Amino acid sequence: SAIERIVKAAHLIDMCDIIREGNPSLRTVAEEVTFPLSDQEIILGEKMMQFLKHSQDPVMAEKMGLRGGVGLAAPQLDISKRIIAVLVPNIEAYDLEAIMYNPKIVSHSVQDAALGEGEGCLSVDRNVPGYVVRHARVTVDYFDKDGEKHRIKLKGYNSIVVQHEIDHINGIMFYDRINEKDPFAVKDGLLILE
Numbered sequence: 001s002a003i004e005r006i007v008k009a010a011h012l013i014d015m016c017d018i019i020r021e022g023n024p025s026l027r028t029v030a031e032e033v034t035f036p037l038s039d040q041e042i043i044l045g046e047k048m049m050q051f052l053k054h055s056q057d058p059v060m061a062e063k064m065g066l067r068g069g070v071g072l073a074a075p076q077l078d079i080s081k082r083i084i085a086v087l088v089p090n091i092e093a094y095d096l097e098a099i100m101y102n103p104k105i106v107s108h109s110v111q112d113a114a115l116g117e118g119e120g121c122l123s124v125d126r127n128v129p130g131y132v133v134r135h136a137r138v139t140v141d142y143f144d145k146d147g148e149k150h151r152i153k154l155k156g157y158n159s160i161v162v163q164h165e166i167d168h169i170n171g172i173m174f175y176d177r178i179n180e181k182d183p184f185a186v187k188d189g190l191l192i193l194e
């Protein structure tokens with residue numbers, strides 16, 4: 001059981017826990033968690049955030065051989081649960097830090113947005129050029145470990161990151177949103193962030 005081994009006290013999430021393309025799990029719609037959460041469900045979220053902080057640490061990232069990142073979804077650990085972790089550093093320390101249970105986009109802008117540098121994925125061991133078209137702004141509802149509801153508004157980079165992770169729990173990959181015909185096509189209403 002992936003969740004049972006990953007949540008053991010001694011376990012450190014590393015690249016070996018992250019599944020890659022082809023694995024059916026990355027294309028499966030994850031199941032909602034129920035409240036109250038089990039200890040394992042709480043621990044899993046904490047382990048996920050620990051991974052992100054480790055991956056963003058020069059020394060630690062080097063020792064563990066981790067790929068830098070600002071987001072992780074449970075399905076990437078082969079755990080089909082609607083749990084995601086996001087950690088964007090200030091360029092107080094982190095501009096955004098959150099472990100989200102059952103996250104959901106409840107509102108979004110007509111305007112679209114895409115990072116000018118494109119996107120990558122820990123589960124994708126290759127580069128796929130192109131603008132990943134997403135919503136410019138999103139209002140997201142989620143629950144914390146205590147079953148408390150949160151409603152936040154995101155824009156710019158953070159909006160992109162959270163949408164990338166929510167896609168994972170819905171079986172969607174970043175390249176699914178890249179225009180096939182022309183990868184770098186700039187449509188009306190699309191904001192390129194850089």
Ligand SMILES: Cc1cccc(CCCN(O)C=O)n1
Nearest residue numbers: 069070071072121122161164
């Ligand atoms: C700059 C940027 C934009 C969107 C998502 C991520 C995180 C990539 C790691 N990953 O594969 C998470 O699921 N980084």
Ligand code: NI
Nearest residue numbers: 120121122123
């Ligand atoms: Ni990803």
